Design a protein around this motif. Structure first.
Motif, PDB file in Angstrom:
ATOM      1  N   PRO A 282      -5.417   0.334  -4.518  1.00 39.90           N
ATOM      2  CA  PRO A 282      -4.241   0.810  -4.118  1.00 39.90           C
ATOM      3  C   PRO A 282      -4.106   1.974  -3.203  1.00 39.90           C
ATOM      4  CG  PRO A 282      -4.485   0.291  -6.515  1.00 39.90           C
ATOM      5  CD  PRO A 282      -5.820   0.066  -6.010  1.00 39.90           C
TER       6      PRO A 282
ATOM      7  N   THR B  89      -1.591  -2.890  -2.957  1.00 42.58           N
ATOM      8  CA  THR B  89      -1.311  -2.346  -4.269  1.00 42.58           C
ATOM      9  C   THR B  89      -2.464  -2.634  -5.193  1.00 42.58           C
ATOM     10  OG1 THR B  89       0.110  -4.347  -4.470  1.00 42.58           O
ATOM     11  CG2 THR B  89       0.991  -2.228  -3.715  1.00 42.58           C
TER      12      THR B  89
ATOM     13  N   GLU C  14       4.831   1.213  -5.892  1.00 44.17           N
ATOM     14  CA  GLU C  14       4.861   0.558  -7.041  1.00 44.17           C
ATOM     15  C   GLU C  14       6.486  -0.064  -7.116  1.00 44.17           C
ATOM     16  OE1 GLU C  14       3.139   3.430  -9.520  1.00 44.17           O
ATOM     17  OE2 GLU C  14       1.290   2.997  -8.775  1.00 44.17           O
TER      18      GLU C  14
ATOM     19  N   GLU D  31       7.342  -2.730  -5.032  1.00 40.45           N
ATOM     20  CA  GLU D  31       6.413  -3.818  -5.432  1.00 40.45           C
ATOM     21  C   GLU D  31       7.336  -4.700  -6.203  1.00 40.45           C
ATOM     22  OE1 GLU D  31       2.860  -2.651  -7.264  1.00 40.45           O
ATOM     23  OE2 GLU D  31       1.906  -4.746  -6.722  1.00 40.45           O
TER      24      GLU D  31
END
Length: 164
Positions: free
Chosen positions: A94, A115, A139, A142
């Motif tokens: 990531p 990621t 994150e 995402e």
């Protein structure tokens, strides 16, 4: 010293947070310089206002198509496309920042932020940076993605530039 650039990310226009990146100019100077310049906008075009059009949880967030907003566009500071500079750096996990492409030697402006480890891309996509600050913001981005990559809200680079 390697340059650092930042993106200020928004979700349907609402500020989300900032992501910063170290660009590996010491290993991939031509590729790093393209991204750095597109981030400051100093050539007269670049990433400011563009979107992340493909976001696949457990894989990557892809952006940089500042001309067509969907994966079909973008251009480099060198011209429409440029060569794969080298494959010194690998997709180790990531936070890796790497160039999207459509075949050998077709780099433009599109990039992805990993990621997940994506080792199968080693030797096919040029790695040129890594997230410094704000991996937590990646994150958060995402979570607006989906299996097919469509986003459930518009994810934008509301501002971008170079940090000291």
């Amino acid at each position: 010293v390697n340059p650092t650039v930042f993106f200020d990310i928004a979700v349907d226009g609402e500020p989300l947070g900032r992501v910063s990146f170290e660009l590996f100019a010491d290993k991939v100077p031509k590729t790093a310089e393209n991204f750095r310049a597109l981030s400051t906008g100093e050539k007269g075009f670049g990433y400011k206002g563009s979107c992340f059009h493909r976001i696949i949880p457990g894989f990557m967030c892809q952006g940089g198509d500042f001309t067509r907003h969907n994966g079909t566009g973008g251009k480099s500071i060198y011209g429409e496309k440029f060569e794969d500079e080298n494959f010194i750096l690998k997709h180790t996990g990531p936070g890796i920042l790497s160039m999207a492409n459509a075949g050998p030697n077709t780099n433009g402006s599109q990039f992805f932020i990993c990621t997940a480890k994506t080792e199968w891309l080693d030797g096919k996509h040029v790695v040129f940076g890594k997230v410094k600050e704000g991996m937590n913001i990646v994150e958060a981005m995402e979570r607006f993605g989906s299996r097919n990559g469509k986003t459930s809200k518009k994810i934008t680079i509301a501002d971008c530039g170079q940090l000291e």
